[PDB]
Amino acid sequence: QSELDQLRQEAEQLKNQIRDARKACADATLSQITNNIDPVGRIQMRTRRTLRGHLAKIYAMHWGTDSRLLVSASQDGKLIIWDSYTTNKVHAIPLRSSWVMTCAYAPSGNYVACGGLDNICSIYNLKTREGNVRVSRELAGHTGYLSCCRFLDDNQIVTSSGDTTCALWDIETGQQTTTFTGHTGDVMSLSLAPDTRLFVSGACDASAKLWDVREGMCRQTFTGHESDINAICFFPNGNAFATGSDDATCRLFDLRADQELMTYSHDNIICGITSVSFSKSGRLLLAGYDDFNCNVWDALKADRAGVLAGHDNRVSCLGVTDDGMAVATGSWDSFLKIWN
Amino acid sequence: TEDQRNEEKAQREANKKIEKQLQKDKQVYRATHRLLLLGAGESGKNTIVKSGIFETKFQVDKVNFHMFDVGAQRDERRKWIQCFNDVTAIIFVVASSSYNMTNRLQAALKLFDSIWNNKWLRDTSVILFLNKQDLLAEKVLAGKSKIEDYFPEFARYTTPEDATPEPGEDPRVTRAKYFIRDEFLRISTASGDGRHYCYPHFTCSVDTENIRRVFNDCRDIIQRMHLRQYELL
């Protein structure tokens, strides 16, 4: 079709124009600006806790806002809320569907959400009126598996799905209020901005998109990764984010420069990244890997700072406490480890 | 710190109660075998059975089986297929008669190959159901369709000696069946290494012994794993 051909030609012209604009804005690289910065040295983190009790592999964990309670989701159909200080189990929620791939803890701490191959985000209220944790709401709009979910607050939650879309929900009515479309592959993860006005999402099209929560439109699209993006996380500042991909690299993208800042890669690393998270200051980038390890990266430089080498199977998830005290890693060996 | 001691005692009691529940949950989980029923929608998979995932529970010889088939999911499988790395077996259902109508059997062969060589599924055994034999029989007997059109290897292929054709079965039907089986077997034996195994079965969608075949294959898988742990195999 000539109309299709000319539309594709116009899209190619627009992509070229964007590329030259980004090149024009690239006066110098982040690597050659941070030369005079002193290196962070060697980061030697030790396993402080090991949470046991999950029968099968763990896909997701999420810290509470109090930096003490965390929820973990396991493929044996269990949600466990742990008291990381004392390793005690606070709750053990049996799941209707055993195939859970994500879990979110509400910032207020009154709710947890989980979802997976059932295409449903289930909301449980922890602050039980009677005493027992029950299903509060089931969100059943997605036509593909849920890969991530994050509470904006109570009564609002953003989910990413395998149907290549992200959605915004009203928990009271159980209805989608906004649908975010534009990804061509499965959306694997999403990260809320600190102000909760925007969120980035990484999909299986090797691209990341910046969305406006209020206005369902997509603001920016970031490319540079070669394979599926499994993990995404905002810089604590909010003007940048990091992505983990199957191409065995992590990359840092700047929102205002609208391009890649630098790549964290090593020759010895040939396995994909499953999870990424920044430290409290953003100077360190923590990435989980398929080779059972977590690598701590200097964010401003490209130097690998340290390694977390405790897990016996694939590292599926990791998260850093809000106060930056500790980092927790879930794994397919059914163990959560706390590191300091 | 009296209030601290009281709340710590309450937390310890709650943790003990949760672990007491988790013990019986573990007992239930270990006694159940989980199966991934994976195959094309035109392969007779639905008839074998009788939301993004459907569950059916059947008990064979007082042994619990939990079989999951794919529901509302996109055709891109490379991400959600990793959820089934620890299942007892993956039941693969293939339409044997669909060797001409799209090279459907070639697509099934490629899917099986990618399943076999995936790093996360390398320890998972596959129960293979070469379905629709009552259709492949009439397809071969009629002669209107040639397997050699889509698989040139069928010209030089000879029926294996270990073949055990059913009574009253045409030699051409048996040769076609065993050629289709040997394609999957050739894929399997390339990178087996003893870590996981394949159990081909000539199947019809209405066969009443399918649960028995699944039970026997799962029991063989469990026995092989246990013998591997003792380094006997």
């Epitope: 290549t164 061509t184 592959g185 299986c204 099209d205 090797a206 490319t223 070669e226 394979s227 599926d228 199957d246 191409d247 065995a248 040939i270 994909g272 | 996109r74 055709d75 891109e76 499988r77 490379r78 297929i81 697509a107 490629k110 899917l111 190959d113 990618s114 399943i115 076999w116 060589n117 995936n118 790093k119 990178s191």
Partner: nanobody
């Protein structure tokens, strides 16, 4: 970004020869396994051929075996499909597909209806 251009497709007589080229950019070519897929008019996608990372392991679909040869040049980041004996049943849009992950033997979704890392495709018409 991951971008793939196919070229060389066009009208050809039955029994003729044609060559398909695939220019790749935005990723390390030598670390990935390449594929060729086609979409017949009004029918689904079918896998044709693939070549390993080094160019050693090559497999074809049965219908084209002995007729099509696949070739890759890691230095030039180019994938080829030389055609020898075309048939009217070979009339299809031919896509240059790439396996989703590097250093992997498996290759899942190259024939999906919506699959990234696949080019726009070039039309091959065989008629008289």
């Amino acid at each position: 970004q991951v971008q793939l251009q196919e070229s060389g497709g066009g009208l050809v007589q039955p029994g003729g020869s044609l060559r398909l080229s695939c220019a790749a950019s935005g990723f390390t070519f030598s670390n990935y396994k390449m594929n060729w897929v086609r979409q017949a008019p009004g029918k689904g996608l079918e896998w044709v051929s693939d070549i390993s990372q080094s160019g050693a392991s090559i497999s074809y679909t049965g219908s084209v075996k002995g007729r099509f040869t696949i070739s890759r040049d890691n230095a030039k980041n180019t994938l080829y499909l030389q055609m020898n004996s075309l048939k009217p049943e070979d009339t299809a849009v031919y896509y240059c597909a790439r396996c989703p992950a590097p250093f992997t033997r498996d290759c899942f979704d190259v024939t999906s209806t919506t699959y990234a890392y696949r080019g726009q495709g070039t039309q091959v018409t065989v008629s008289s």
